[PDB]
Design a protein around this ligand. Structure first.
Ligand SMILES: CCCCCCCCCCCCCCCCCC(=O)OC[C@H](COP(=O)(O)OCCN)OC(=O)CCCCCCCCCCCCCCCCC
Ligand SMILES: CCCCCCCCCCCCCCCCCC(=O)OC[C@H](COP(=O)(O)OCCN)OC(=O)CCCCCCCCCCCCCCCCC
Ligand SMILES: CCCCCCCCCCCCCCCCCC(=O)OC[C@H](COP(=O)(O)OCCN)OC(=O)CCCCCCCCCCCCCCCCC
Ligand SMILES: CCCCCCCCCCCCCCCCCC(=O)OC[C@H](COP(=O)(O)OCCN)OC(=O)CCCCCCCCCCCCCCCCC
Ligand SMILES: CCCCCCCCCCCCCCCCCC(=O)OC[C@H](COP(=O)(O)OCCN)OC(=O)CCCCCCCCCCCCCCCCC
Ligand SMILES: CCCCCCCCCCCCCCCCCCCC
Ligand SMILES: CCCCCCCCCCCCCCCCCCCC
Ligand SMILES: CCCCCCCCCCCCCCCCCCCC
Ligand SMILES: CCCCCCCCCCCCCCCCCCCC
Lengths: 100, 101, 480, 162, 309
C-alpha cells in the first residue's frame, strides 16, 4: 500500500542531493561522498522498482550497483591518498594543469 | 497478520527500544551524577576487506539456495571461488598482505 | 535459462579472456616478469580471435536472459580484441621505460577487453551496466598508471569522478525504465504500450538519464569536456585503448539497445539524439581548430567522429543500412585511431619518467622517422575523410544514410565539420614534413611499427577497394 | 510498514542533507551511516530483506569503514577549507541548488502520472535472490567477480605506499 | 481491556525484556568471574555505584559526539545481535528471516566502536592503536560470514530456528568443524579478546583506545565486551551445538549449560593461550582462515548436492 511513486521520488531526492554535494564541495573526499550518495540512491530506485513488480531483479541490480560502489570507492580513495601524498592538499581546483 | 508475528514484532521493537534506552539512560546517569572538581597498509587491508566482503555477499546469496541451484550453480560458485582464491594468492604473493616486509 | 554446451561454445571469447585474466594473475603471483606476462595476455587475445572463428561456426542464439551472440556480437568483439592487442603491443616499449610494476597494465587491459566483449554481446540492462563498468574501472587504473606523473594522476582523478557520476546517472535511468517497464531485457523496453502511447514520461526520463551516462562514455556534447584532458594526460597506449575499444564497444551496445527497444523509434529521443549529433560534430571540429597538442586534437576528433556515428544511429529505424554504415565506419575509425595513437605511442616510448616531459613534437618528423610520418599522414587523411582512405568510405556511408533518412541538418553538419576537420588534419599532416631545429632497437618496438604500418596499408587498400570490408560487415547481421 | 517507510525515508533525506552541508569529515560520514541505516529500513519496509541486510553489512559496514579509515589516516584538521567554508556562501551554492531543483522537478514530473497499484511489501527472500543470481544471472556474478578483481588491482597499484 | 491477543503480545514482550535483562546481568557476572578467577554481586553493585558517582570528564580537545557514541556502539552492537538467538521453543526475541545476517550487520556496525573511540580520543598513539585494532577486526570479519555460511548451506536458510531444527539429529560441530573453528577464532577476534587483546602492545607508537575513557564510558566498554562474549557463545551454541536440543533436560537448561561452558572456555583460552605478534595474527587470518572457509563452503555444497536423490 506504498505507492511506487513515493519510493521513486525519495530516490530522486537522494540522487539530487548527492549530485549537489558532488558539485558544490571543493574537497575531493566530499565529492567521493556525494558519488556514494548518488549511486546508493540509484540502487534504492532499483530496489523500489523491483519490489513494485514483485521480482528479484531489483535486488540483483542493487547487488551489482553496490559491487560497483565498493570497487569505485576503493579506486577513488586510492587516488585521494595518492593526491594527498603527492601534494599535501585535497583541493580539486588545484589539480587543473590540463586545460583547453 | 498472525498474532504471533505481530507479537514478535512488538517484542523486537520493545527489545531494541529498551536496550538503546538502557544504554543512553546509563550514560545519562553517569554524566549527571557525581560532583566535579600513518602507513598506507591500513588502507590496503580495509580495501581488501571491502572487496572480499562483496564477494562474500555473493557467496552469502548462494549458500541459502544451494539445493535449488543444483550442480550448475555449484559449478558457477566454484568458478567464482577459484577466481577469488586466485586474487587472494596474488595479493599474498606480491606482498600486499605481508604486514612486515 | 540454463547454460547448454552450445551456450558454452558461443561464450568462447569471454571464457578465454577470463581464463587469460586468471592465468596472467597467477603468473604475476609466481614471478613478476614483463615479457612472459605480456606474451600470455597477447596469446589469450589471439586465442579469443580464433574463438570468435569457432563462435562463427556455431549459430546465433541468446546465451542467457543477459547475452545474445550473433554476427554483430562477433564483429564488435573482433574490433575490441584488435584494439586490445594493439594496446598491448604499444604498451610493451612504453612499459619497458617504466620503473614500477608493469604487468598489472596487462591485467587491466584484459579485464577491459572482457568488458568490451560483454558490451558486444549485451542484450540486457544488466550486461550493459556491467560491461560499461568493466570497461571503466581498469581504465581508471590504466589512465593513472603513471600516477607519479602529474598529468596522468590528474586525468585519472577526472575520469574516475566523472565516470562514477555517469554510472550513477545511467543506473538511475535504468531504474526508472525498469520502474515503467517490468522487464530489463532490451526487447521489452516499451512493449507494454500501444495506440501511440510510446512516449511514456518515465520511460523517456529513464532513457534520458541513460543517454547522459552513455554520452559521457561516447564523448558526446555536452558530456565531452573530459575527453581532451583524459586523452592528453593518460599514457599513450592507454590513450589508444580509450580512443578505440571503449568507444567502439559502448557505441555497439547503444546500437543494439536502440535497435531492439520499441521506444528506440520514439520521436522525442530521435530529436534529442539529432541535437546531440549536430552539436557533437560542430563542437568537436571547431574545438580542434587551434590545438598544438596532438592528443587533445585527437580527443576533439573523437568527439566529432562519434557525432558522425550518432548521425548514422539516428536513421536506424527509418533506413536499412544504418548498421552496415556503423560497422564500416567503426572498422575505419578503429584502424585510423590505431595508426595515429600508435605513432604517438611509439614516439613517446620508452617512458622517460614522471618528471621528464612527454611532448610529441610532430614537426619535422619525416627527417628522422619517415615511415612513421607516412603512417601518421595517412591517418590524418583518413580521419579527414579523404578519398583513397577508409575514413572516406565511412563518411560516404554516413552521408548516404543521412540522405536516405532526409536528415538534412545532420548532412550539412557533416559537410561543415568535415571542412573544419580538413583544416586541422592537414595542418598536422603538413607540419609532419616541415623542418624542426632540434628534438627502440628491440623487436617489440618493431612490432608496434609493423602494427601502425599494417593499419596504414589497410586504410589505403580498403579506401581504394572497400568491397571486402563491406561484404564482411554485411554478413555480420544481428537478429532481426 | 508504511509508517516505517515514511519515517525512514524522511530520516534518510534529512541525513544526506546534513551530509552535503557539513564541514567535519567524521561527522559527515556519521550522518552518511545514519542515512544508510534509514535506507536499509526503507528496504525492509518494502520487503527487500536481502537488500537491507546488504545495506547494513556492506554499504554502512564495509565501504563507510573504508571512508573512515581514509579520513583518520589523512588526519584532516582543517586544511585551509574548513577555515574557508566556501560551500555555504550563497554565490557558490545557489547555482547548483537551482540546477538540482530543476532536475528534481523534471524527474518528479516524470514519476507522477505513471500507473501505480502500490508496492505490496511482500518479502522477497535471499533465497529467491540467490536463485536468480545463480540462474539467469550467472554471467553477471562471474563478471562482477572480475569487476571487483579489477577494482582490487587498480586500488593496489595506485594506493600502495612504497 | 482483556483479550488473549493482547495477553500474547505482553507475554512475548515480557519474554524479550527478561532475555535482555538476563543477558546484561550475565555479562556483568562474567566480568566478576573473570576478575575473580584471574559478596561478588555486592562488589559489582559497589563498582557500578562508583562508575555512577565518579565525574565523567570528556576531554576539552575531543569531539564530544563521537567520544560518547563509541561506548554505545561497543555495548549495543552485540547486545542487539543477541536478539536472533533462540534460547528455548517460544523464547526467541525475533524470528527473523535474515537472522545470522542480522548478526553480521551488528558486527559490521560494531567495528565503529573501536574506530570512533580512537578518533575521538585526541592522541596520535591512541589513533594508531585504533587503526591496528580495526585492521585486525576487519581481517577476521572478512571470513566470519563464510564460516557461518557452511552452516547456512546445510540448513538451507538464514533462520536460527531452522538451523536448530536442522541440528535435530547431528550437531553441526561434526560436519561444520572447520566452520566451527574459524567462527570461534573470528568471534574471539571481533570482540577484541585474548589472544587478540592488545594489538597496540607490539609497538610503543601505539596505546590502547580504552585509555582516556573513564567512568561509565569505561564501564560501558567493559560490559559491552563481556556481553559480546555472551552473545558469541550463544550464537556458537545455536549454530554448532543444536541450540536448546538435548535428550533429557529441559531445553533452556541445555542451552544455558552449553553457553556457560563456552563462556568458561573463553575464560581459560584467555588464561592459557599466549599472545601472537600482530603480523602473525593478520597473516594467519588472511592466509589461512579465509581460504579454509571458502573450501569448506565448496565441500559442504558438494556433499549436500551429492546426498540429494
Ligand atoms: C581484410 C579486410 C579488413 C577486415 C577488418 C576486420 C576487423 C574485425 C576483425 C574481426 C571480424 C569478425 C567478423 C565476423 C562476422 C561473422 C558473421 C557471421 O555470421 O559469420 C558466419 C560465418 C559462417 O557462415 P555460416 O554457415 O552462416 O555460419 C552459421 C551457420 N550455423 O562465420 C564466419 O565467417 C567466421 C568469421 C571468423 C572471423 C575470425 C577473425 C580472426 C581475426 C582476423 C584479423 C584480421 C586482421 C585485422 C587487423 C590487422 C592488424 C591491424
Ligand atoms: C552546406 C552544404 C550542405 C547543405 C545541407 C545538405 C543539403 C540540404 C538539402 C535540403 C533539401 C530539402 C528537401 C525538402 C523536402 C523534403 C521532403 C520531401 O518531400 O522531399 C521530396 C522527396 C521525397 O519525397 P518522395 O515522395 O520520395 O519523392 C521522390 C521524388 N522527389 O525528396 C527526395 O526525393 C530527395 C530530396 C533531395 C533534396 C536535395 C539533396 C541534395 C542537395 C544538394 C546540395 C544542397 C543545395 C545546394 C547548395 C546550397 C548552398 C550550400
Ligand atoms: C556563395 C555562397 C554559395 C556557395 C557556398 C560554397 C561553400 C563551399 C565552398 C567554399 C568554402 C569556403 C571556405 C572559406 C575558408 C577557407 C579556409 C581558409 O581560409 O583557411 C586559411 C586559414 C588559415 O590562415 P590564417 O588566417 O593565417 O590562420 C589563422 C590561424 N592560425 O584558416 C583559418 O583561418 C581557419 C579555417 C577554419 C576551417 C575552414 C573554414 C570552414 C567554414 C565552413 C565551411 C563550409 C561553408 C558552407 C557555406 C558557407 C557560406 C558560403
Ligand atoms: C518516532 C519519531 C522519530 C524518533 C527518532 C527516530 C527513531 C527511528 C525511527 C525509524 C525506525 C522505526 C520506524 C517504525 C517501525 C515500527 C515497526 C513497523 O512498522 O513494522 C512494520 C513492518 C513489519 O513487517 P511486516 O511483516 O511487513 O508487517 C506487516 C504485518 N505482517 O516493518 C518492516 O517491514 C520493517 C520495519 C523497519 C525496518 C527496521 C527498523 C530500521 C531502523 C533504521 C534506523 C535509522 C537510523 C535512525 C537514527 C535516529 C536518530 C537520528
Ligand atoms: C542513537 C540511536 C541510533 C539509532 C538506533 C536504532 C533506531 C531504531 C530503533 C527503533 C526500532 C523500532 C522497531 C523496528 C521494527 C522491528 C520489527 C521488524 O523489523 O520487523 C520487520 C521484519 C520482520 O521479518 P520476519 O519476521 O522475518 O518476516 C515477517 C513477514 N512479514 O524484520 C526485519 O526486517 C528486521 C531487520 C531490521 C532490524 C533493524 C534493527 C535496528 C538497527 C540499528 C542498530 C543500531 C546499532 C548501534 C548504532 C550504530 C551506529 C550509528
Ligand atoms: C543439473 C545437473 C547438471 C550436471 C552438469 C553440470 C556441469 C555442466 C554445465 C556447466 C555450466 C558452466 C557454466 C559456467 C559459466 C562461467 C562463465 C564465466 C565468465 C567469465
Ligand atoms: C599513397 C599515400 C598518399 C598519402 C601519404 C603521403 C606520404 C607518402 C610518403 C612520404 C612522402 C614524403 C615527401 C617529402 C617531401 C619533402 C621535400 C623537401 C624538399 C623540398
Ligand atoms: C556553426 C555551424 C552551422 C552548420 C549548419 C549547417 C546547416 C546545413 C543546411 C541545413 C538545411 C536544412 C533544410 C531543411 C528543409 C526541410 C524541409 C521539410 C519540408 C517538409
Ligand atoms: C547465558 C544464558 C543467557 C540466557 C538469556 C535468556 C534467558 C531466558 C530465561 C528463560 C527461562 C525459561 C525458559 C522456558 C522454560 C523451560 C526451562 C524451565 C527451567 C528453567
Amino acid at each position: 500500500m506504498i505507492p511506487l511513486q513515493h519510493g521513486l521520488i525519495l530516490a530522486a531526492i537522494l540522487f539530487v542531493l548527492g549530485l549537489t554535494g558532488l558539485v558544490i564541495r571543493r574537497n575531493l573526499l566530499f565529492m567521493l561522498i556525494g558519488l556514494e550518495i548518488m549511486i546508493n540512491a540509484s540502487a534504492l530506485a532499483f530496489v523500489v522498482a523491483g519490489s513494485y513488480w514483485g521480482q528479484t531483479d531489483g535486488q540483483v541490480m542493487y547487488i551489482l550497483a553496490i559491487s560497483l560502489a565498493a570497487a569505485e570507492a576503493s579506486i577513488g580513495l586510492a587516488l585521494l591518498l595518492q593526491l594527498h601524498r603527492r601534494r599535501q592538499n585535497l583541493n580539486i581546483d588545484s589539480v587543473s594543469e590540463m586545460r583547453g | 497478520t498472525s498474532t504471533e508475528v505481530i507479537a514478535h514484532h512488538w517484542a523486537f521493537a520493545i527489545f531494541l527500544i529498551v536496550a538503546i534506552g538502557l544504554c543512553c539512560l546509563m550514560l545519562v546517569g553517569g554524566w549527571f551524577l557525581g560532583g566535579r572538581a600513518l602507513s598506507a597498509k591500513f588502507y590496503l587491508v580495509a580495501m581488501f576487506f571491502v572487496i572480499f566482503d562483496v564477494e562474500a555477499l555473493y557467496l552469502f546469496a548462494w549458500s541459502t539456495s544451494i539445493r535449488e541451484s543444483g550442480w550448475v550453480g555449484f559449478v558457477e560458485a566454484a568458478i567464482f571461488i577459484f577466481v577469488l582464491l586466485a586474487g587472494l594468492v596474488y595479493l599474498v604473493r606480491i606482498g600486499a598482505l605481508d604486514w612486515t616486509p | 535459462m540454463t547454460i547448454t554446451p552450445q551456450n558454452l561454445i558461443a561464450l568462447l571469447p569471454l571464457l578465454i579472456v577470463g581464463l587469460t585474466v586468471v592465468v596472467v594473475m597467477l603468473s604475476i603471483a609466481w614471478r613478476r616478469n614483463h615479457f612472459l606476462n605480456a606474451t600470455l595476455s597477447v596469446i589469450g587475445l589471439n586465442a579469443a580471435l580464433v574463438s570468435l572463428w569457432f563462435v562463427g561456426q556455431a549459430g546465433a542464439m541468446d546465451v542467457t536472459p543477459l547475452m545474445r551472440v550473433d554476427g554483430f556480437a562477433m564483429l564488435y568483439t573482433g574490433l575490441v580484441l584488435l584494439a586490445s592487442l594493439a594496446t598491448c603491443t604499444f604498451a610493451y616499449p612504453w612499459l619497458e621505460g617504466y620503473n614500477d610494476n608493469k604487468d598489472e597494465f596487462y591485467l587491466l587491459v584484459l579485464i577491459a577487453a572482457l568488458g568490451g566483449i560483454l558490451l558486444a554481446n549485451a542484450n540486457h540492462l544488466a550486461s550493459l551496466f556491467l560491461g560499461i563498468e568493466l570497461i571503466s574501472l581498469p581504465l581508471f587504473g590504466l589512465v593513472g598508471y603513471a600516477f607519479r606523473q602529474k598529468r596522468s594522476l590528474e586525468a585519472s582523478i577526472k575520469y574516475t569522478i566523472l565516470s562514477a557520476a555517469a554510472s550513477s546517472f545511467l543506473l538511475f535511468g535504468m531504474a526508472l525504465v525498469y520502474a515503467q517497464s517490468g522487464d530489463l531485457s532490451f526487447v521489452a523496453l516499451g512493449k507494454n504500450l500501444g495506440d501511440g502511447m510510446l512516449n511514456e514520461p518515465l520511460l523517456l526520463a529513464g532513457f534520458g538519464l541513460m543517454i547522459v551516462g552513455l554520452g559521457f562514455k561516447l564523448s558526446l556534447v555536452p558530456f565531452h569536456l573530459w575527453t581532451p584532458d583524459v586523452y592528453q594526460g593518460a599514457p599513450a597506449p592507454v590513450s589508444t585503448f580509450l580512443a578505440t575499444a571503449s568507444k567502439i564497444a559502448i557505441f555497439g551496445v547503444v546500437m543494439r539497445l536502440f535497435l531492439y527497444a520499441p521506444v528506440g523509434d520514439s520521436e522525442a529521443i530521435r530529436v534529442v539524439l539529432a541535437i546531440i549529433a549536430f552539436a557533437s560534430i560542430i563542437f568537436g571540429n571547431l574545438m580542434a581548430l587551434s590545438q598544438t597538442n596532438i592528443k587533445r586534437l585527437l580527443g576533439y576528433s573523437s568527439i566529432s567522429h562519434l557525432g558522425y556515428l550518432l548521425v548514422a544511429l539516428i536513421a536506424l529505424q527509418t533506413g536499412e543500412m544504418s548498421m552496415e554504415a556503423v560497422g564500416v565506419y567503426l572498422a575505419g575509425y578503429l584502424f585510423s585511431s590505431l595508426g595515429a595513437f600508435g605513432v604517438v605511442s611509439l614516439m613517446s616510448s620508452p617512458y622517460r619518467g614522471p618528471d621528464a616531459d612527454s611532448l610529441f613534437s610532430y614537426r619535422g618528423l619525416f627527417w628522422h622517422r619517415p615511415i612513421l610520418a607516412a603512417v601518421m599522414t595517412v591517418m590524418m587523411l583518413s580521419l579527414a575523410g579523404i578519398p583513397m582512405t577508409l575514413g572516406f568510405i565511412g563518411k560516404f556511408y554516413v552521408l548516404a544514410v543521412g540522405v536516405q533518412a532526409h536528415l538534412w541538418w545532420l548532412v550539412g553538419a557533416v559537410v561543415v565539420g568535415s571542412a573544419i576537420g580538413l583544416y586541422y588534419y592537414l595542418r598536422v599532416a603538413v607540419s609532419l614534413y616541415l623542418h624542426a631545429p632540434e628534438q627502440p632497437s628491440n623487436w617489440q618496438y618493431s612490432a608496434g611499427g609493423i602494427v601502425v604500418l599494417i593499419s596504414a596499408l589497410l586504410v589505403l587498400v580498403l579506401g581504394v577497394w572497400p568491397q571486402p570490408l563491406i561484404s564482411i560487415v554485411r554478413l555480420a547481421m544481428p537478429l532481426m | 510498514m508504511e509508517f516505517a517507510f515514511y519515517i525512514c525515508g524522511l530520516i534518510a533525506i534529512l541525513a544526506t542533507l546534513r551530509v552535503i552541508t557539513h564541514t567535519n569529515p567524521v561527522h559527515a560520514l556519521l550522518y552518511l551511516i545514519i542515512s544508510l541505516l534509514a535506507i536499509s529500513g526503507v528496504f525492509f519496509s518494502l520487503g527487500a530483506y536481502f537488500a537491507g541486510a546488504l545495506e547494513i553489512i556492506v554499504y554502512a559496514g564495509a565501504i563507510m569503514v573504508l571512508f573512515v579509515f581514509v579520513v583518520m589516516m589523512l588526519n584532516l584538521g582543517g586544511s585551509e577549507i574548513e577555515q574557508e567554508r566556501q560551500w555555504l556562501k550563497p554565490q557558490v551554492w545557489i547555482g547548483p541548488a537551482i540546477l538540482s531543483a530543476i532536475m528534481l522537478v523534471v524527474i518528479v514530473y516524470a514519476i507522477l502520472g505513471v500507473n501505480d497499484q502500490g508496492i505490496d511489501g511482500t518479502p522477497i527472500s535471499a533465497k529467491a535472490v540467490g536463485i536468480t543470481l545463480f540462474g539467469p544471472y550467472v554471467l553477471a556474478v562471474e563478471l562482477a567477480s572480475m569487476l571487483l578483481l579489477a577494482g582490487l588491482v587498480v586500488a593496489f597499484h595506485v594506493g600502495r605506499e612504497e | 481491556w482483556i483479550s488473549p491477543e493482547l495477553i500474547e503480545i505482553l507475554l512475548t514482550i515480557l519474554k524479550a525484556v527478561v532475555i535482555l535483562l538476563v543477558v546484561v546481568t550475565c555479562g556483568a557476572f562474567m566480568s566478576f568471574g573473570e576478575r575473580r578467577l584471574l559478596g561478588g554481586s555486592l562488589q559489582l553493585v559497589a563498582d557500578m555505584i562508583k562508575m555512577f558517582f565518579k565525574e565523567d570528564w570528556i576531554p576539552k580537545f575531543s569531539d564530544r559526539v563521537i567520544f560518547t557514541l563509541a561506548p554505545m556502539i561497543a555495548f549495543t552492537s552485540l547486545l542487539l545481535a543477541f536478539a536472533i538467538v533462540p534460547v528455548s521453543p517460544g523464547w526467541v526475541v525475533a524470528d527473523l528471516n535474515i537472522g545470522i545476517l542480522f548478526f553480521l550487520m551488528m558486527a559490521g556496525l560494531a567495528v565503529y566502536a573501536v574506530l570512533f573511540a580512537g578518533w575521538s580520543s585526541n592522541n596520535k598513539y591512541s589513533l594508531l592503536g585504533a587503526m591496528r585494532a580495526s585492521a585486525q577486526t576487519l581481517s577476521y570479519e572478512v571470513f566470519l560470514g563464510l564460516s557461518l555460511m557452511g552452516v547456512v548451506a546445510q540448513a538451507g536458510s538464514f533462520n536460527m530456528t531452522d538451523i536448530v531444527n536442522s541440528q535435530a539429529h547431528v550437531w553441526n560441530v561434526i560436519p561444520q568443524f572447520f566452520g566451527f573453528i574459524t567462527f570461534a577464532i573470528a568471534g574471539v577476534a571481533v570482540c577484541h579478546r585474548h589472544p587478540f587483546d592488545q594489538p597496540e602492545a607490539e609497538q610503543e607508537l601505539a596505546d590502547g583506545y580504552h585509555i582516556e575513557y573513564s567512568g561509565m564510558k569505561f564501564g560501558l566498554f567493559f560490559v559491552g565486551e563481556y556481553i559480546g562474549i555472551v552473545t558469541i557463545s550463544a550464537l556458537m551454541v545455536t549454530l554448532f551445538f543444536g541450540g536448546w536440543q538435548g535428550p533429557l533436560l529441559p531445553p533452556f537448561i541445555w542451552f544455558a549449560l552449553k553457553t556457560a561452558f563456552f563462556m568458561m572456555m573463553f575464560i581459560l583460552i584467555r588464561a592459557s593461550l599466549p599472545r601472537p605478534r600482530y603480523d602473525q595474527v593478520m597473516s594467519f587470518g588472511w592466509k589461512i582462515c579465509l581460504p579454509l572457509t571458502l573450501i569448506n563452503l565448496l565441500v559442504t555444497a558438494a556433499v549436500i548436492l551429492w546426498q540429494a536423490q
